[PDB]
């Protein structure tokens, strides 16, 4: 929503004040991420992970909030548009993370094999005739 040709100032597009809808913040399942993307490397901060967050992003977030959301005044208008320099850092081989990894693991085991060390859920015990754990 920060891209508009008619609101270009010094080569950067900016978002006007008349395009902000007040109901967008209470929309949990409209602006959401679906899949995302994995990388075949070790965890860490790198150049190919897209939503990788360093210690320079939280300082920028605290700075922009204390900078009044990057207002752009105009002639005969106190505040006209919102500067696009405050949302640049939320704008963007690699594999999919959502394909399941359990299919290449071991088979699930029956319950008595899982009960090899301490016994849980036996009918002939004290705890079967007590109130369970909710």
């Amino acid at each position: 929503d920060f891209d508009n040709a008619y609101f270009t100032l010094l080569g950067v597009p900016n978002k006007p004040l008349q395009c902000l809808d007040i109901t967008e913040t209470g929309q949990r399942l409209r602006n959401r991420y679906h899949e995302g993307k994995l990388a075949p490397i070790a965890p860490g901060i790198n150049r190919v992970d897209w939503p990788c967050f360093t210690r320079a992003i939280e300082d920028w977030s605290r700075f922009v909030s204390s900078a009044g959301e990057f207002k752009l005044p105009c002639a005969s208008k106190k505040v006209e548009s919102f500067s696009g320099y405050a949302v640049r850092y939320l704008k963007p081989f690699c594999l999919n993370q959502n394909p399941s990894l359990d299919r290449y693991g071991q088979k699930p085991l029956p319950f008595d094999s899982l009960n090899a060390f301490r016994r849980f859920g036996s009918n002939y015990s004290r705890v079967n005739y007590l109130t369970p754990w909710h």
Binding site: Y6, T8, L9, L10, G11
Partner: peptide, 28 residues
Amino acid sequence: PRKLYDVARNTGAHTSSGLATSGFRTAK
């Protein structure tokens, strides 16, 4: 063209512009 959208921003009867097409720009 991003040059067009910056020149045409301040075109009008009572609008002051400092940008110049293909040259030096004003110091103000």
